[PDB]
Each structure stands twice: as C-alpha cells, then as structure tokens.
Amino acid sequence: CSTTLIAIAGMTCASCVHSIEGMISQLEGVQQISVSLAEGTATVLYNPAVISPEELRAAIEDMGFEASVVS
Amino acid sequence: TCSTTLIAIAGMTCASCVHSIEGMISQLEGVQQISVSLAEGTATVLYNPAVISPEELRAAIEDMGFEASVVS
Ligand SMILES: [Ca+2]
C-alpha cells in the first residue's frame, strides 16, 4: 500500500540479502521487499495501518545491519 | 623488519567474513599477520614491505567484496 526506501549498510553476501528479505517479508503488513546490493537499499511495499518505515528499519537493525529510512 | 598498516574495511557484519579475510589475506606472500577488528571495522596487517604494499592488501580485500581504504 505504501512503499519506502531503506538504506542498509554492510550487505555483502547473497545469504544476508535473503535473510533480510525473508525476515522482513514475513512481518505482518509487509507485502513485498526487494534489496539492491549495488545501491545498498531495500525497497519495501507495506501496509501503514500495520507497520511503519521506522519499524522496518528497527527490524533490519535487530538483524545486525545499520539502516536508515531514505524516503 | 616488518611494517604495520591499518586498513578500514566497510561492511564486515559477521564472524565468518572476518575469518575469511584473515585466512585469505594472511596467505599472501609477505603477510606475517592480520588482525581484523569486526568492532572497529578495521584490519591491522603486519607485512613485509619489500614483498607487498598496503595498496596491494587493500585491493585484495576489495576483491573479496569489501570496500577498503589504507588509513595508516
Ligand atoms: Ca583475528
């Protein structure tokens, strides 16, 4: 319903991007996620009634990557 | 004598990569030791400067997929 761009630092293998996508995509309200390793971003399609970019960033950071919401 | 160089390494996020970097870089000719700090995002390398340069070490670390810069 909404889309957010999140900068994620230190994504340096495929396995981590899949972990990130796997974990984030399974959160309630998260419809879709695509990570770009080249950009260092995750684009997330989410339901703002349920989840926010700030909580997505927090979830990425609980996985151990520095993150910040871009837009 | 051997020289010491400090290399900042961006994007180390796991113990496994640390071990990989140390394992591969240590094998390079002229590299006595390398101590990677996951905490500080750096590597200290004790190396023979007649055999290998900091720029060569930086490049080798970058070939492993981490952005690296020689600091000191
Ligand atoms: Ca070590």
Side-chain angles (χ1 to χ4, degrees), chain A residues 12-13 16, chain B residues 11-19 38 66:
Chain A
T12 202
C13 58
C16 282
Chain B
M12 298 181 298
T13 41
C14 67
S16 184
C17 287
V18 166
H19 293 124
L38 181 57
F66 302 91

mmCIF file of all heavy atoms in Angstrom, chain A residues 12-13 16, chain B residues 11-19 38 66:
data_model
loop_
_atom_site.group_PDB
_atom_site.id
_atom_site.type_symbol
_atom_site.label_atom_id
_atom_site.label_comp_id
_atom_site.label_asym_id
_atom_site.label_seq_id
_atom_site.Cartn_x
_atom_site.Cartn_y
_atom_site.Cartn_z
ATOM 1 N N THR A 12 26.798 -7.678 2.158
ATOM 2 C CA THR A 12 27.978 -8.059 1.399
ATOM 3 C C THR A 12 27.967 -9.512 0.923
ATOM 4 O O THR A 12 28.943 -9.975 0.353
ATOM 5 C CB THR A 12 29.240 -7.662 2.231
ATOM 6 O OG1 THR A 12 30.372 -7.537 1.379
ATOM 7 C CG2 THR A 12 29.544 -8.628 3.275
ATOM 8 N N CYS A 13 26.859 -10.221 1.132
ATOM 9 C CA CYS A 13 26.647 -11.538 0.543
ATOM 10 C C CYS A 13 25.175 -11.741 0.192
ATOM 11 O O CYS A 13 24.285 -11.032 0.690
ATOM 12 C CB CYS A 13 27.046 -12.621 1.523
ATOM 13 S SG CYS A 13 26.135 -12.504 3.086
ATOM 14 N N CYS A 16 22.872 -12.970 3.234
ATOM 15 C CA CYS A 16 22.377 -11.891 4.092
ATOM 16 C C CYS A 16 21.197 -11.181 3.448
ATOM 17 O O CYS A 16 20.198 -10.922 4.122
ATOM 18 C CB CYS A 16 23.482 -10.895 4.434
ATOM 19 S SG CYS A 16 24.588 -11.496 5.727
ATOM 20 N N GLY B 11 31.672 -2.933 5.770
ATOM 21 C CA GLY B 11 30.694 -3.976 5.514
ATOM 22 C C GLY B 11 30.906 -5.328 6.135
ATOM 23 O O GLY B 11 30.171 -6.243 5.822
ATOM 24 N N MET B 12 31.905 -5.475 7.002
ATOM 25 C CA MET B 12 32.079 -6.719 7.741
ATOM 26 C C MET B 12 30.992 -6.776 8.800
ATOM 27 O O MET B 12 30.916 -5.899 9.649
ATOM 28 C CB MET B 12 33.427 -6.758 8.400
ATOM 29 C CG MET B 12 34.563 -6.704 7.420
ATOM 30 S SD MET B 12 36.093 -6.788 8.334
ATOM 31 C CE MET B 12 36.056 -5.309 9.349
ATOM 32 N N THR B 13 30.135 -7.790 8.724
ATOM 33 C CA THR B 13 28.963 -7.882 9.594
ATOM 34 C C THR B 13 28.836 -9.255 10.275
ATOM 35 O O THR B 13 27.858 -9.521 10.932
ATOM 36 C CB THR B 13 27.678 -7.544 8.778
ATOM 37 O OG1 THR B 13 27.768 -8.140 7.478
ATOM 38 C CG2 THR B 13 27.524 -6.037 8.592
ATOM 39 N N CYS B 14 29.842 -10.110 10.148
ATOM 40 C CA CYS B 14 29.747 -11.465 10.649
ATOM 41 C C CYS B 14 31.133 -12.013 10.949
ATOM 42 O O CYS B 14 32.134 -11.578 10.365
ATOM 43 C CB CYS B 14 29.066 -12.347 9.618
ATOM 44 S SG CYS B 14 30.072 -12.554 8.128
ATOM 45 N N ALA B 15 31.185 -12.964 11.863
ATOM 46 C CA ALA B 15 32.443 -13.592 12.269
ATOM 47 C C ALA B 15 33.065 -14.361 11.098
ATOM 48 O O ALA B 15 34.287 -14.385 10.921
ATOM 49 C CB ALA B 15 32.212 -14.524 13.461
ATOM 50 N N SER B 16 32.213 -14.949 10.279
ATOM 51 C CA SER B 16 32.655 -15.769 9.175
ATOM 52 C C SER B 16 33.469 -14.985 8.147
ATOM 53 O O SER B 16 34.505 -15.444 7.694
ATOM 54 C CB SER B 16 31.450 -16.426 8.514
ATOM 55 O OG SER B 16 31.893 -17.295 7.503
ATOM 56 N N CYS B 17 33.000 -13.804 7.792
ATOM 57 C CA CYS B 17 33.744 -12.929 6.892
ATOM 58 C C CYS B 17 35.075 -12.498 7.482
ATOM 59 O O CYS B 17 36.065 -12.474 6.772
ATOM 60 C CB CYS B 17 32.925 -11.708 6.502
ATOM 61 S SG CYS B 17 31.612 -12.156 5.354
ATOM 62 N N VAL B 18 35.100 -12.200 8.780
ATOM 63 C CA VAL B 18 36.350 -11.831 9.457
ATOM 64 C C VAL B 18 37.395 -12.910 9.272
ATOM 65 O O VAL B 18 38.513 -12.642 8.820
ATOM 66 C CB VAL B 18 36.148 -11.579 10.961
ATOM 67 C CG1 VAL B 18 37.482 -11.527 11.704
ATOM 68 C CG2 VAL B 18 35.368 -10.290 11.164
ATOM 69 N N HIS B 19 36.992 -14.129 9.604
ATOM 70 C CA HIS B 19 37.839 -15.282 9.463
ATOM 71 C C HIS B 19 38.274 -15.477 8.022
ATOM 72 O O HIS B 19 39.432 -15.786 7.775
ATOM 73 C CB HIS B 19 37.125 -16.532 9.989
ATOM 74 C CG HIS B 19 36.898 -16.509 11.473
ATOM 75 N ND1 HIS B 19 35.646 -16.660 12.038
ATOM 76 C CD2 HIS B 19 37.755 -16.318 12.507
ATOM 77 C CE1 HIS B 19 35.743 -16.587 13.353
ATOM 78 N NE2 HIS B 19 37.011 -16.382 13.665
ATOM 79 N N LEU B 38 36.271 -6.672 13.882
ATOM 80 C CA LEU B 38 34.891 -6.526 13.490
ATOM 81 C C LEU B 38 34.272 -5.301 14.187
ATOM 82 O O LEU B 38 33.575 -4.514 13.547
ATOM 83 C CB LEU B 38 34.129 -7.793 13.831
ATOM 84 C CG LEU B 38 32.651 -7.868 13.485
ATOM 85 C CD1 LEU B 38 32.444 -7.639 11.989
ATOM 86 C CD2 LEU B 38 32.114 -9.222 13.928
ATOM 87 N N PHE B 66 34.748 -6.390 -0.092
ATOM 88 C CA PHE B 66 34.618 -5.364 0.935
ATOM 89 C C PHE B 66 35.335 -4.122 0.479
ATOM 90 O O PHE B 66 36.456 -4.212 -0.018
ATOM 91 C CB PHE B 66 35.203 -5.853 2.253
ATOM 92 C CG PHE B 66 34.563 -7.103 2.751
ATOM 93 C CD1 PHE B 66 35.083 -8.347 2.406
ATOM 94 C CD2 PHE B 66 33.410 -7.042 3.531
ATOM 95 C CE1 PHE B 66 34.481 -9.514 2.842
ATOM 96 C CE2 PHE B 66 32.798 -8.203 3.964
ATOM 97 C CZ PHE B 66 33.341 -9.435 3.629
#
